[PDB]
Design a protein around this ligand. Structure first.
Ligand SMILES: [Mg+2]
Ligand SMILES: [Mg+2]
Ligand SMILES: [Mg+2]
Ligand SMILES: [Mg+2]
Ligand SMILES: [Mg+2]
Ligand SMILES: [Mg+2]
Ligand SMILES: [Mg+2]
Ligand SMILES: [Mg+2]
Ligand SMILES: [Zn+2]
Lengths: 56, 51, 196, 67
RNA sequence: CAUGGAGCCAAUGAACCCGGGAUUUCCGAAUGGGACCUCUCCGUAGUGAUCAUUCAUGAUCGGGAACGCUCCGAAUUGAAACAUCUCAGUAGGAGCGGGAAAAGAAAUCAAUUGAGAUGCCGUAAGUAACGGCGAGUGAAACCGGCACAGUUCAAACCGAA
């Protein structure tokens, strides 16, 4: 259908479930990883230095 | 009908219990300084992301 | 000359290509190729070198043959736009030697021990072999020891992955003193890595 | 004072302590059952006093190796 | 938090504060198996993976505001364009790790003849040096301070002491 409100009626599925380790709704049900804390990918918790300004 | 497991139903029950008017005696004791909480919603509005 | 047999072993390994050691190389290389990346061997292949580097016959001391490829740092062509000086990567060998790679793999395989030293033991057209000496710090024999109890300290964890071994200090540019070491001591990071 | 002090709990015998524990549990069950029907309790301090007393008794048993 | 009703607790010393114990659901390094199922399956009540020994037992795993060590590593920008150069070993990434870490007792620096481990601060100095010798980049030693500390193996001799 149209790219606007006509194709937004098929919006009945879900792509992210709820994570066990952090409780945030960011668990990818296809790749089986949490996109916020990294659960499923690793035993460590996801942190990147680009999640904040260079502190200078 | 959205067949749920135990945990999903548990979280749904909690989110149901949070829709409550603040008790009248709380409003009396705090001298009309507490009249609402940020957990109030309505079922036909923004969907909750509990599940 | 009244000489120990360690001296004779040292002489024999002084020039491998011109002694009986070449035939032993021919036999040993096949058995070594059949084996895996990291292998525990009961006795060191070269006794004199091990004793020189701090090897003793006691519990809690382990020796291992590691296996590492030859060549430089295998590097990928950049996907996006560089500036024609950073675009080339085929002739850019690494900045880390092969002994360091060997010791780091050995450390990764043995999570409870700690690396002490290593030495060269052979090589062919595809591979190089080193032996790494590992010491267990939580064994009572090591704890009672007076020449090895320094390893039961809270500054010796991860001793190989922070460049504290001998090859690590060679690679950090701190094998000497004086001219040329202006920007390599007391560390590479202290001078914004302009040394090395 | 309280439903029981620590001195009486430590002084009693093992069966005496257990019996006091069952009596307290039964009274708590009755008190909760009455209050569950939307009624003002006849004495709404009983529940707190009872639960704290049962906590005392269980602590004393666990300390004396009883359970 | 948060002086409303009705109750209870407290001189058997409460409330409160300092120190020490107990209970401590499920997930989580998560570790008997399994997770678009924070629960579920067999219950054989459960040492998950990798390691060391005398094979009794023991070690590692995750977190921590910044600081620390090792390795990999851009472009916008400046040069009034731009390619060496600069931005810059910066931003970013991987590994390891403590209350600090790294270094550390000369195969050193000097100059005619001397000094005597290391680190940090001051100065040397925008100097020597590099560079479409353009724009720019850029030290160390001598000297003055803070604080001071030196030692252990391999081998020659004895051969289980
Ligand atoms: Mg579109
Ligand atoms: Mg930063
Ligand atoms: Mg491997
Ligand atoms: Mg140190
Ligand atoms: Mg320009
Ligand atoms: Mg750690
Ligand atoms: Mg050193
Ligand atoms: Mg530069
Ligand atoms: Zn998560």
């Amino acid at each position: 259908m149209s790219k606007g409100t006509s194709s937004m009626g098929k919006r009945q599925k879900r792509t992210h479930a709820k994570c066990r380790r952090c409780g945030s709704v960011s668990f990818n049900v296809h790749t089986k990883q949490c996109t916020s804390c990294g659960f499923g990918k690793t035993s460590r918790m996801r942190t990147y230095k680009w999640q904040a300004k260079c502190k200078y | 009908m959205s067949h749920n497991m135990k945990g999903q139903k548990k979280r749904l029950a909690k989110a149901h219990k949070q829709n409550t008017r603040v008790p009248v005696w709380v409003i009396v004791k705090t001298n009309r300084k507490v009249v609402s909480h940020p957990r109030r919603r309505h079922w036909r509005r923004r969907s909750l992301d509990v599940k | 000359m009244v000489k120990s047999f360690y001296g004779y072993v040292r002489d024999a390994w002084k020039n491998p290509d011109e002694t009986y050691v070449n035939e032993l190389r021919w036999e040993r290389l096949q058995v070594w190729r059949k084996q895996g990346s990291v292998t525990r061997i009961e006795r060191p292949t070269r006794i004199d070198r091990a004793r020189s580097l701090g090897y003793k016959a006691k519990q809690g001391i382990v020796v291992v043959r590691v296996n590492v490829r030859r060549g430089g740092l295998g590097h990928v062509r950049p996907n996006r736009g560089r500036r024609t000086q950073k675009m080339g990567k085929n002739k850019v060998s690494g900045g880390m030697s092969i002994q360091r790679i060997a010791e780091v793999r050995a450390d990764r395989r043995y999570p409870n021990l700690e690396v002490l030293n290593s030495y060269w033991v052979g090589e062919d057209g595809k591979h190089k072999w080193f032996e790494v000496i590992l010491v267990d710090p939580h064994h009572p024999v090591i704890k009672s020891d007076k020449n090895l109890n320094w390893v039961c300290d809270p500054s010796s964890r991860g001793r190989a992955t922070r460049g504290k071994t001998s090859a690590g200090r060679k690679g950090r540019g701190m094998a000497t003193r004086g001219k040329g070491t202006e920007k390599t001591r007391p560390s590479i990071r202290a001078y914004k890595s302009r040394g090395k | 004072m309280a439903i029981l002090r620590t001195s009486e709990i430590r002084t009693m015998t093992i069966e005496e302590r257990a019996d006091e524990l069952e009596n307290l549990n039964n009274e708590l069950v009755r008190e909760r059952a009455l209050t569950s029907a939307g009624g003002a309790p006849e004495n709404p301090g009983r529940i707190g006093e009872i639960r704290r007393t049962i906590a005392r008794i269980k602590t004393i048993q666990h300390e004396l190796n009883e359970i």
